Design a protein around this motif. Structure first.
Motif, PDB file in Angstrom:
ATOM      1  N   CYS A   1       1.469  -1.926 -11.531  1.00 12.54           N
ATOM      2  CA  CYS A   1       0.885  -3.070 -10.846  1.00 12.54           C
ATOM      3  C   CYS A   1      -0.046  -2.598  -9.743  1.00 12.54           C
ATOM      4  O   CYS A   1       0.326  -1.758  -8.932  1.00 12.54           O
ATOM      5  CB  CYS A   1       1.975  -3.969 -10.269  1.00 12.54           C
ATOM      6  SG  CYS A   1       2.832  -4.962 -11.496  1.00 12.54           S
TER       7      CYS A   1
ATOM      8  N   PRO B   1      12.842  -2.248 -13.735  1.00 15.82           N
ATOM      9  CA  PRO B   1      11.460  -2.129 -14.192  1.00 15.82           C
ATOM     10  C   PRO B   1      11.144  -0.705 -14.607  1.00 15.82           C
ATOM     11  O   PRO B   1      11.690   0.257 -14.065  1.00 15.82           O
ATOM     12  CB  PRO B   1      10.653  -2.533 -12.960  1.00 15.82           C
ATOM     13  CG  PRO B   1      11.495  -2.116 -11.842  1.00 15.82           C
ATOM     14  CD  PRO B   1      12.918  -2.311 -12.269  1.00 15.82           C
TER      15      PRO B   1
ATOM     16  N   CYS C   1       7.622   1.107 -14.749  1.00 15.53           N
ATOM     17  CA  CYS C   1       6.205   0.956 -14.477  1.00 15.53           C
ATOM     18  C   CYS C   1       5.483   2.288 -14.567  1.00 15.53           C
ATOM     19  O   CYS C   1       4.265   2.351 -14.435  1.00 15.53           O
ATOM     20  CB  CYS C   1       5.999   0.327 -13.104  1.00 15.53           C
ATOM     21  SG  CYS C   1       6.598  -1.365 -12.989  1.00 15.53           S
TER      22      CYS C   1
ATOM     23  N   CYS D   1       3.287   1.325  -8.472  1.00 18.67           N
ATOM     24  CA  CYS D   1       2.678   0.196  -7.786  1.00 18.67           C
ATOM     25  C   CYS D   1       1.738   0.690  -6.700  1.00 18.67           C
ATOM     26  O   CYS D   1       2.109   1.533  -5.892  1.00 18.67           O
ATOM     27  CB  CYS D   1       3.747  -0.713  -7.189  1.00 18.67           C
ATOM     28  SG  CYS D   1       4.607  -1.729  -8.393  1.00 18.67           S
TER      29      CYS D   1
ATOM     30  N   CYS E   1       9.526   4.245 -11.629  1.00 25.00           N
ATOM     31  CA  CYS E   1       8.104   4.116 -11.377  1.00 25.00           C
ATOM     32  C   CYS E   1       7.401   5.458 -11.488  1.00 25.00           C
ATOM     33  O   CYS E   1       6.182   5.537 -11.374  1.00 25.00           O
ATOM     34  CB  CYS E   1       7.868   3.502 -10.001  1.00 25.00           C
ATOM     35  SG  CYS E   1       8.444   1.803  -9.864  1.00 25.00           S
TER      36      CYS E   1
HETATM   37  C1  LIG Z   1       4.454  -5.240 -10.854  1.00 17.93           C
HETATM   38  C2  LIG Z   1       5.793  -4.590 -10.655  1.00 17.93           C
HETATM   39  C3  LIG Z   1       6.818  -5.258  -9.996  1.00 17.93           C
HETATM   40  C4  LIG Z   1       8.049  -4.647  -9.816  1.00 17.93           C
HETATM   41  C5  LIG Z   1       8.274  -3.364 -10.291  1.00 17.93           C
HETATM   42  C6  LIG Z   1       7.266  -2.673 -10.956  1.00 17.93           C
HETATM   43  C7  LIG Z   1       7.498  -1.283 -11.473  1.00 17.93           C
HETATM   44  C8  LIG Z   1       6.037  -3.303 -11.125  1.00 17.93           C
END
Ligand SMILES: *Cc1cccc(C*)c1
Ligand SMILES: *Cc1cccc(C*)c1
Ligand SMILES: *Cc1cccc(C*)c1
Ligand SMILES: *Cc1cccc(C*)c1
Ligand SMILES: *Cc1cccc(C*)c1
Ligand SMILES: *Cc1cccc(C*)c1
Ligand SMILES: *Cc1cccc(C*)c1
Ligand SMILES: *Cc1cccc(C*)c1
Ligand SMILES: *Cc1cccc(C*)c1
Ligand SMILES: *Cc1cccc(C*)c1
Ligand SMILES: *Cc1cccc(C*)c1
Ligand SMILES: *Cc1cccc(C*)c1
Ligand SMILES: *Cc1cccc(C*)c1
Ligand SMILES: *Cc1cccc(C*)c1
Ligand SMILES: *Cc1cccc(C*)c1
Lengths: 7, 21, 21, 21, 21, 21, 7, 7, 7, 7, 21, 21, 21, 21, 21, 7, 7, 7, 7, 7, 21, 21, 21, 21, 21, 7, 7, 7, 7, 7
Positions: free
Chosen positions: C1, C19, C21, D1, D21
């Motif tokens: 994000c 999540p 990501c 992020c 992440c």
């Molecule tokens: C956009 C987003 C929100 C929360 C966690 C992640 C890895 C990405």
């Protein structure tokens, strides 16, 4: 504009 | 997700469950 | 994000569950 | 992020469970 | 996570459980 | 995490459980 | 403009 | 604009 | 703009 | 803008 | 992607933005 | 990605932004 | 990524930003 | 990443930013 | 990362920033 | 057979 | 067969 | 077959 | 087959 | 086949 | 995948190669 | 994956190769 | 993975290679 | 992984290679 | 990993190679 | 109801 | 209901 | 209900 | 319900 | 329900 969460 | 503009003007609840981004 | 702009103008609850990501 | 701008203008609760992440 | 700007303008609670960043 | 700017303007509670960064 | 969540 | 969480 | 958490 | 946590 | 054979015979620029494979 | 054969025969630039593989 | 064969035969620049593999 | 064969035959620059492998 | 074969045949610069492997 | 990119 | 990138 | 990058 | 990087 | 990096 | 009920009543072999879920 | 019920009633072999969940 | 119920009722072999969960 | 219930009722072999959880 | 219940009811071999949890 | 795999 | 794997 | 693995 | 592994 | 491992 408050938020209330209950499980 | 890019350039997201989240401005509800009130209460905001975001529930995201196991995203793969 | 990237470049997320979270400005609800009120109460904010973010629940993110595992999540990738 | 990257470049996240979290400004709810109120109460903020962030619950993040095992992010990768 | 880079360049995060967390300014809720109120109460802030961050609960992060086993992140891998 | 780099260049994090945590300025809630109120009470701040950060609970981080076993992060791997 | 409030939010209420109940499970 | 407060937040209340109950489990 | 306060926060209250209850488990 | 206070924070209250109860378990 | 499997068995990709990228042989342009010149200059090659590959810009891939957030793939999910 | 499996069995990728990247042989441009020249200059090669690969810019990959947040892949999830 | 498995069995990748990167042989550009020239200059090579690989910029990978936050991969999740 | 497994069995990667990086042989550009020239100059090589690899910039990897926060990988999670 | 396993069985990586980095043989650029020239100059090599590897910049890796906070990997989690 | 060169490549030129300008933004 | 060169590559030039400008932002 | 060189590479030039400028930001 | 050289590499030049400028930010 | 040299490498030059400038920030 | 949610609420999967795998009961073959015999021998079971599951080979899953690089899923993204 | 959630609420998976793996009960083959026999021999079970699960081979999972680089999942991203 | 949550609420997994692995009860093969026999021999069980689980081979998981570089998962990212 | 949460709430995993591994009860094969026999022999159990778990081989996990470089997990990132 | 949380709330794991490993009860094979037999022989158990767990081989975990460089986990990052 | 057995399973046999050969490559 | 056995399983046999050969590569 | 046994398991046999051969590589 | 035994397990045999051979490499 | 035994386990045998051979490399
Ligand atoms: C956009 C987003 C929100 C929360 C966690 C992640 C890895 C990405
Ligand atoms: C757009 C978006 C929302 C929440 C999580 C992700 C990864 C992306
Ligand atoms: C966007 C984001 C939120 C919380 C945790 C991570 C790793 C990423
Ligand atoms: C974005 C982020 C929040 C909390 C922990 C990490 C590792 C990353
Ligand atoms: C972003 C972050 C928050 C707490 C702990 C770590 C390692 C990283
Ligand atoms: C075919 C392909 C190109 C770039 C990235 C992915 C994940 C796949
Ligand atoms: C095919 C591919 C290119 C770059 C990154 C990934 C994860 C995959
Ligand atoms: C294919 C690939 C390129 C760079 C990073 C990863 C994790 C994978
Ligand atoms: C394929 C790869 C390149 C750089 C870092 C990782 C973890 C993986
Ligand atoms: C493939 C790789 C490159 C650099 C660092 C790690 C952990 C892995
Ligand atoms: C349904 C399912 C099977 C195997 C792997 C995933 C991620 C999902
Ligand atoms: C459903 C599932 C099976 C194996 C691995 C993952 C991450 C998910
Ligand atoms: C569902 C699952 C199986 C093995 C490893 C992970 C991370 C997840
Ligand atoms: C579900 C799981 C199995 C083995 C290792 C991890 C990190 C997770
Ligand atoms: C679930 C799990 C198994 C082995 C090692 C770790 C870190 C986690």
């Amino acid at each position: 504009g408050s938020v209330q969460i209950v499980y | 997700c890019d350039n997201i503009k989240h401005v509800p003007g009130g209460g905001s609840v975001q529930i995201v469950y196991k995203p793969v981004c």
